[PDB]
Design a protein around this ligand. Structure first.
Ligand SMILES: Nc1ncnc2c1ncn2[C@@H]1O[C@H](COP(=O)(O)OP(=O)(O)O)[C@@H](O)[C@H]1O
Ligand SMILES: Nc1ncnc2c1ncn2[C@@H]1O[C@H](COP(=O)(O)OP(=O)(O)O)[C@@H](O)[C@H]1O
Ligand SMILES: [Mg+2]
Ligand SMILES: [Mg+2]
Lengths: 330, 334
């Protein structure tokens, strides 16, 4: 009963763009609900629309709303950034780590997780593991350990697609996690000639597995929290992105059956995120430039279609076979 | 619709019975179906009736065999011998272990089982544990290690009951079990003044817990085998608190009142809880002297038989589904 949240961010018109004679051609009819864009005769409504002067913090407050609360209550949650190259996926997911104002969703998330744990009463033992890898040309390289290239996907005991053989690092403070991110960022350069080119055509996948045990209940909860910065969505295209569209499309109205998750590694990893058991926000990012009109329009279409999709979401309680049997009676 | 199976065994007229001037007071009308006795001159019917010269083997095949393939199919099954002292319980359940012809139900079941395990076409990992203990005045003693008299009875996740902290010896071959049996047999002779009296007044129970994993698809199944030699059914007050509980449980199950069943009123009846009305396939073997002098005792053994055969057991395969599988089995309800 849980619509995928879709949130739309326009960046400021930049230089290449004024000086190549691109006009700013986007409007924001309002509202009051502040959730609407007009481009060249089309009109779109989402959960929020952010204007070029919207700050990382403001954006974080909407996009990452309950997610850390949710993940700490044992819900899976995901955020990913979708749109063409240079529209601001990385600015948004990452921004400038270390800069208070200019940092993006991931780092805020990270501080915000630990602050919540501290301020938490009830004595709970947190195991927190993190992974960081990329999908490029439908192949997975672990950024934490570059000998693990071309990794494979497999389903688990619950039949949830996970990436097998990937480094999972324990962490106990923000500084820990940031050290891991900085590790991954240089590893990504290994064998890479043009990083602008490489990262615009690959998916960066950041994963925070959050296990909690209550040291009285004996109650174990769990939450997978995925932060993803996609390959650029431009044209045709980049094939995991057709897969993403095809999965989105197949989820319309109804419909939980015959869904082409396997069409790509990406879409397998994101399986719960789209239709399954997670709360999912998507940030679509857009240029406001006239030159980018059709690319913007499709990003918005994609957005349009994805808004309508509803997830099947519950607490990930960790039970033994015995308990689950009993928990069944009426 | 697994009704408990009742089987009736008469043994030959014995030496002391003759000298004391007792006649054979029992006929076997044929049948054909081989299923009835008439005792001066009231008739009783059972699943099967064995004349004084039935061989061990015949008794085994015609009353036990099917239990071996059941437990291998993951069902619980139990066999017990009931009837007055001297009537042939121990001869039936045990016989003479060494002796290929004179051995009884226990060793043959054990042979049968390993053999079937040997020749299984599909590949399985089979773990077998046996337990071996004695009930005596509602007090459980472990024959595998005498450091434990007085063992508790506990429930479990499903329901059991089962006996806490009894020796469970892992076994791999018949000789493995035969040794364990010889272990409990000499370990019984001690803490005990006369054996015959003690024997006659106690229940001996043998459990074979039979666990299996299908290596190919990891499908898991379990089975318990209770092989019980009861105390003599005679008040000869002088009757047994466990036998009486047995009579009452069966009595309860023979009318319509469930609502309530006296299981708790004895340890014995708690162990045999699934065997009686619960989730196991149960065969009872009533043993009888054919001597005129025993006519009364014989008849109550018969009547107990006649009441037990009408009990219905409520059985299903003991599948051990994993956690994940149960989780969804519960989307059924909610
Ligand atoms: N909302 C924004 N405000 C200011 N500058 C931005 C914004 N979004 C993107 N930029 C700038 O645009 C350039 C490209 O953005 P980037 O996030 O790398 O695009 P993408 O990762 O989607 O290809 C970078 O200089 C970035 O800092
Ligand atoms: N079917 C039978 N055929 C021949 N002898 C038997 C048979 N059943 C019992 N006996 C003999 O009669 C005696 C009583 O056997 P037993 O099983 O000890 O009685 P109980 O019911 O007290 O255990 C033993 O000496 C045994 O060898
Ligand atoms: Mg990029
Ligand atoms: Mg005896």
């Amino acid at each position: 009963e849980d619509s995928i949240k879709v949130v739309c961010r326009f960046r400021p018109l930049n230089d290449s763009e004024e000086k190549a004679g691109s006009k700013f051609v986007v409007k924001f009819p309002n509202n009051v609900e502040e959730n609407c864009i007009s481009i060249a005769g089309k009109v779109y409504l989402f959960d929020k629309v952010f204007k070029p002067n919207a700050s990382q913090e403001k954006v974080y407050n909407e996009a990452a709303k309950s997610i850390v609360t949710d993940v700490l209550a044992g819900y899976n949650g995901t955020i990913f950034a979708y749109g063409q190259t240079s529209s601001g996926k990385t600015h948004t997911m990452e921004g400038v780590i270390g800069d208070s104002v200019k940092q993006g969703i991931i780092p805020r998330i990270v501080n915000d997780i630990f602050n919540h744990i501290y301020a938490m009463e009830v004595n709970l033992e947190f195991h927190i593991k993190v992974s960081y890898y990329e999908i490029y040309m439908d192949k997975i390289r672990d950024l934490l350990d570059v000998s693990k290239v071309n990794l494979s996907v497999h389903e688990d005991k619950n039949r949830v697609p996970y990436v097998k053989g990937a480094t999972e690092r324990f962490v106990s403070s923000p500084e820990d996690v940031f050290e891991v991110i900085e590790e991954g960022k240089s590893n990504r350069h290994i064998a890479v000639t043009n990083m602008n080119e490489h990262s615009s055509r690959s998916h960066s996948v950041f994963l925070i597995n959050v296990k909690q045990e209550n040291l009285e209940n004996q109650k174990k909860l769990s939450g997978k929290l995925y932060l993803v910065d996609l390959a650029g969505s431009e044209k045709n295209i980049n094939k995991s992105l057709s897969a993403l569209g095809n999965v989105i499309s197949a989820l319309a109205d109804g419909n939980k059956t015959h869904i082409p998750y396997r069409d790509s590694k990406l879409t397998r990893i994101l399986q719960e995120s789209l239709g399954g058991n997670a709360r999912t926000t998507i940030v679509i990012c857009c240029s406001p430039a006239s030159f980018n009109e059709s690319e913007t329009k499709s990003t918005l279409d994609f957005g349009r279609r994805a808004k309508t999709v509803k997830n099947v979401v519950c607490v990930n309680e960790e039970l033994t076979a015995e308990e689950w049997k009993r928990r069944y009676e009426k």
